[PDB]
Amino acid sequence: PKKRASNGRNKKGRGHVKPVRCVNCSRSVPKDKAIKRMAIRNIVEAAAIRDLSEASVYAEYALPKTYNKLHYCISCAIHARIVRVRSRTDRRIRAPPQRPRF
């Protein structure tokens, strides 16, 4: 039975797509069906900014952020809670989960 209309892959008109490797289990998966997450974080946590700020020669220096895109395999992500099973009627809600920070 057709689980999804878009086949849960999102190509529809390219025949084939270059595959990219998972960051957790190193699985090769097509880039479209690769459930990607941009992890923008600081080099230090919120519990360390104080010590670095008081141990800094520059008074107004703002610590820079680390950027990287994460390409998961699907199984690791279902395991690592970043992607969640849904009820059948709620599968089709394409919009990203509504921001809790309202």
Task: Give binding residues for Zn(2+) as ranges.
Answer: 22, 25, 73, 76
CA distances 3 to 9, 11, 31, 39, 88, Å, are 12, 16, 20, 30, 9
Choices 7-15, 22-30, 82-90, 94-102; region in contact with another protein by CB under 8 A: 22-30
Q: Which is nearer to Zn ion, 24 or 53 (CB)?
A: 24
Candidate residues 68, 80, 91, 93; the one interacting with another protein per rule CB under 8 A? 68
Q: Is 33 exposed, middle or buried (0-12, 13-18, 19+ CB in 10 A)?
A: middle
Chain residues in the site for another protein (CB under 8 A) = 20-28, 39, 43-45, 48, 51-52, 54-58, 60-61, 63-68, 73
